[PDB]
Design an enzyme around this catalytic site. Structure first.
Site, PDB file in Angstrom:
ATOM      1  N   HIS A 113      -5.291  55.123  27.738  1.00  0.00           N
ATOM      2  CA  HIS A 113      -6.591  55.712  27.469  1.00  0.00           C
ATOM      3  C   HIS A 113      -6.627  56.274  26.057  1.00  0.00           C
ATOM      4  CE1 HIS A 113     -10.409  57.528  28.564  1.00  0.00           C
ATOM      5  NE2 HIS A 113     -10.016  58.714  28.148  1.00  0.00           N
ATOM      6  N   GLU A 114      -5.580  57.016  25.707  1.00  0.00           N
ATOM      7  CA  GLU A 114      -5.469  57.633  24.396  1.00  0.00           C
ATOM      8  C   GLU A 114      -5.406  56.623  23.269  1.00  0.00           C
ATOM      9  OE1 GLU A 114      -6.306  60.581  24.377  1.00  0.00           O
ATOM     10  OE2 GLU A 114      -6.069  60.808  26.530  1.00  0.00           O
ATOM     11  N   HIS A 117      -8.572  55.416  22.035  1.00  0.00           N
ATOM     12  CA  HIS A 117      -9.216  56.290  21.067  1.00  0.00           C
ATOM     13  C   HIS A 117      -8.619  56.125  19.688  1.00  0.00           C
ATOM     14  CE1 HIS A 117     -11.732  58.339  23.862  1.00  0.00           C
ATOM     15  NE2 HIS A 117     -10.759  58.909  24.542  1.00  0.00           N
ATOM     16  N   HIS A 123     -15.887  57.016  25.081  1.00  0.00           N
ATOM     17  CA  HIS A 123     -16.017  56.921  26.527  1.00  0.00           C
ATOM     18  C   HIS A 123     -17.062  55.904  26.963  1.00  0.00           C
ATOM     19  CE1 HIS A 123     -14.097  61.124  26.851  1.00  0.00           C
ATOM     20  NE2 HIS A 123     -13.183  60.188  27.007  1.00  0.00           N
TER      21      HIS A 123
HETATM   22 ZN   LIG Z   1     -10.850  60.256  26.446  1.00  0.00          ZN
END
Ligand SMILES: [Zn+2]
Ligand SMILES: [Ca+2]
Ligand SMILES: [Ca+2]
Ligand SMILES: [Ca+2]
Ligand SMILES: [Zn+2]
Length: 161
Positions: A113-114, A117, A123
């Protein structure tokens, strides 16, 4: 729309969490990077010294940057969008219990998930997307795959392999 101006990024695991063995940590990271590496021309290379594009580390409460951690629960971690210095870095709150299974906060799941980014993704609206706001596990950790939405996202920035 921040994004990397190079398809080959370097990463460095600054330190490790007491929750998992040195190896369980590296695997979570490698498996997390590999999910994005598979759907784009992105290539990662491990660095054991100096400055890397994605400085991965564990920490509690205040720890350097502009976003402190809040202890147990809530903000499990966070990453910065593509860029220099602090940007692109991924930090994990070591106030949580990082696990290989589902007993606590799955390191792989969050790490992936990180990285999303660190690469430039925000999101998503898709409930079953990797870049979904709320963290949840899954029953067969083995059955996990990048959600369709994530594919489109990561490719709109770097394109297909
Ligand atoms: Zn996030
Ligand atoms: Ca960086
Ligand atoms: Ca937290
Ligand atoms: Ca911990
Ligand atoms: Zn941080």
């Amino acid at each position: 729309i921040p994004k990397w101006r190079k398809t080959h990024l370097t990463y460095r695991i600054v330190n490790y969490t007491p929750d998992l063995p040195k190896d369980a940590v590296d695997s979570a990271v490698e498996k997390a990077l590999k999910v994005w590496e598979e759907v784009t021309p992105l290539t990662f290379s491990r660095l054991y010294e100096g400055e890397a594009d994605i400085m991965i580390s564990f920490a509690v409460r205040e720890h350097g940057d502009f976003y402190p951690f809040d202890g147990p629960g809530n903000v499990l971690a966070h990453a910065y969008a593509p860029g220099p210095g602090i940007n692109g870095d991924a930090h994990f709150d070591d106030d949580e219990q990082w696990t290989k299974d589902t007993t606590g906060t799955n390191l792989f799941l969050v790490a992936a998930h990180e990285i999303g980014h660190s690469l430039g993704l925000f999101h998503s609206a898709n409930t079953e997307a990797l870049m979904y706001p709320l963290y949840h596990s899954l029953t067969d950790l083995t059955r996990f795959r990048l959600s369709q939405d994530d594919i489109n996202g990561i490719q709109s920035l770097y394109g297909p392999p």
